[PDB]
């Protein structure tokens, strides 16, 4: 065969310890670029003027952060949505001041993780599998596009994208709550149901298969030695697990069909996270959570506060303090 | 009411900064991750045990045999992510362990908050911040937000205190 | 930064001690 066909066979080869694949050919350089840049900047990047008001925020370890407080800081608001590669800067020092590394990291990373998703499909095809694992991963992927791409698009600036840092993530969440009442938005309420419930059904399924492991071991060995990799037989009695769990609630609240059961496990958190990713993506366009402020009034017209009004008091405190030097006019419209 | 409690915990306890809550998040998000990834893996390594397009009917609750391929799943994740489960018992024990351990850790952190025994601050950052008006991090920025939550929500949230705060003492940035 | 001097020894031993515990158990498992 010819060089190119040799090359194609290597790329799509199923004997590589890690699968490469055509999606892998974009994924590997973009992820490497993003990881390398993220690691150097987390450790050594100088302070970034995130809000465009010549007020640099120090995000890196050498400039006085620890693991919890450091971040790679979003790019300057003066830049907005403009593209700011290294070669648009007059110098690396300028690029660092204005938060260039944020743009480089997130763009290489969205690309690479999108190709991650594709790669999940690609290998399932070479292995003879069903294709839809990659659909499950689209829920985490979509959420990452929401906080790094969609929300900055709707608000006009990557400076309002999520910072790459532990405390920066919290800053992002608090200011989002002030500006959108995401707690009061049904899609975030679906996200919570999605992950609480996903943890629930995770503990349930683990604990129920674990409870109905067939005796294959003595009391001195890990029961994990009772399962052998590739064995044909199942190592737990699902009839016993259904029998236990059917009586804990009632017989039809419980699954008798492993396939239904595992589709349920896949579907529930994935849909939840789709909805919450959709929630950040549409609050990107200022369609915010319910507003019940002063919704209750008495016969005279006095306001009868409800818990929604107490939330609004917290929200107001976030609103008036966030980015405290950045607003010259009374409305924070983006 | 519960949302109000969330926000209370942010502005008064700085609870997002608490490593016990952080472990809790990891175990809950981790649990949901395990739920989705396992359910999806089994659904996409099923054996063809029937001739229909709806694959749910090709499973008999008393059959002896595995309904999906541990071996192919294993190879897929080994080659996609680098490592894979190979032991079905360890897998399902790991699924109980993660979210259970997550919630227990968060409970410990709230016991501390019973006592206002918080992880509110990093002392080294406060010392430098006091001395150096140019030192800003995301930690100091979040503390300004908590200071807003406390003073703006306290009079209505805790009315038995009869807090009266004139406009002029309320923390506010410019314009807002 | 005016961090806590004992932080270093606390982090050092936090890692060292339990890690060594596992290594000892693992190595004496392989040699049988």
């Amino acid at each position: 065969a010819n060089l190119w066909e040799r090359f194609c066979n290597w790329v799509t080869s199923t004997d590589n310890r890690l699968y490469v694949g055509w999606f892998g050919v974009i994924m590997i350089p973009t992820l490497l670029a993003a990881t390398i840049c993220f690691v150097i900047a987390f450790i050594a990047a100088p302070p970034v003027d995130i809000d465009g008001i010549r007020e640099p925020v120090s995000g890196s370890l050498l400039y006085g952060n620890n693991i919890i407080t450091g971040a790679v800081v979003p790019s300057s608001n003066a830049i907005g949505l403009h593209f700011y590669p290294i070669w648009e800067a007059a110098s690396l020092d300028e690029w660092l001041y204005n938060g260039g590394p944020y743009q480089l990291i997130i763009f290489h990373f969205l690309l690479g993780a999108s190709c991650y998703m594709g790669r999940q499909w690609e290998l399932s095809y070479r292995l003879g599998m069903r294709p839809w694992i990659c659909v499950a991963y689209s829920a985490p992927l979509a959420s990452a596009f929401a906080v790094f791409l969609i929300y900055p698009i709707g608000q006009g600036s990557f400076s309002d994208g999520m910072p790459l840092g532990i405390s920066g993530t919290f800053n992002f969440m608090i200011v989002f709550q002030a500006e959108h009442n995401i707690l009061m938005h049904p899609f975030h309420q679906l996200g919570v149901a999605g992950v609480f419930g996903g943890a629930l059904f995770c503990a349930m399924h683990g604990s129920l298969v674990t409870s109905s492991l067939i005796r294959e071991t003595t009391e001195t060995e890990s029961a994990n030695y009772g399962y052998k990799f590739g064995q044909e037989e199942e190592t737990y009695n699902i009839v016993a697990a259904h029998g236990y769990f059917g009586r804990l609630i009632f017989q039809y609240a419980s699954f008798n069909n492993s396939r239904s059961l595992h589709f349920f496990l896949a579907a529930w958190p994935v849909v939840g996270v789709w909805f919450t990713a959709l929630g950040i993506s549409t609050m990107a366009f200022n369609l915010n959570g319910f507003n019940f402020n002063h919704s209750v009034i008495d016969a005279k017209g006095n306001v009868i506060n409800t818990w929604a009004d107490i939330i609004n008091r917290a929200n107001l405190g976030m609103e008036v303090m966030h980015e405290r030097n950045a607003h010259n006019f009374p409305l924070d419209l983006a | 009411a519960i949302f109000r409690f969330l926000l209370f915990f942010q502005g008064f306890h700085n609870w997002t900064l608490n490593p016990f809550h952080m472990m809790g998040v990891a175990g809950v998000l981790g649990g949901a991750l395990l739920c989705a990834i396992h359910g999806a893996t089994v659904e996409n390594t099923l054996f063809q045990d029937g001739e229909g397009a709806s694959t749910f009917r090709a499973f008999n609750p008393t059959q002896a045999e595995e309904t999906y391929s541990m071996v192919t799943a294993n190879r897929f994740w080994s080659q996609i992510f680098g490592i894979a489960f190979s032991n079905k018992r360890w897998l399902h024990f790991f699924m109980l362990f993660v979210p259970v351990t997550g919630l227990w850790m968060s409970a410990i952190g709230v016991v501390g908050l019973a006592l206002n025994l918080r992880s509110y601050d990093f002392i080294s950052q406060e010392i430098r911040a006091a001395e150096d008006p140019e030192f800003e991090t995301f930690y100091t920025k979040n503390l300004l937000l908590n200071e807003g939550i406390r003073a703006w929500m306290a009079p209505q949230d805790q009315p038995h205190e009869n807090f009266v705060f004139p406009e002029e003492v309320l923390p506010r940035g410019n314009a807002l | 930064m005016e961090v806590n001097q004992l932080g270093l020894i606390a982090t050092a031993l936090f890692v060292l001690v339990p890690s060594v515990f596992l290594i000892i158990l693992y190595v004496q498992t392989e040699s049988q």
Binding site: L61 | V71 | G7, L8, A12
Partner: peptide, 30 residues
Amino acid sequence: METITYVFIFACIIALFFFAIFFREPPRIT
């Protein structure tokens, strides 16, 4: 000293990844 500690621990984790993937117990079918 604190920067070095954070970076040391992070460095070790990445080493662990390498051994965990390329020097794993190989899964075998019996």
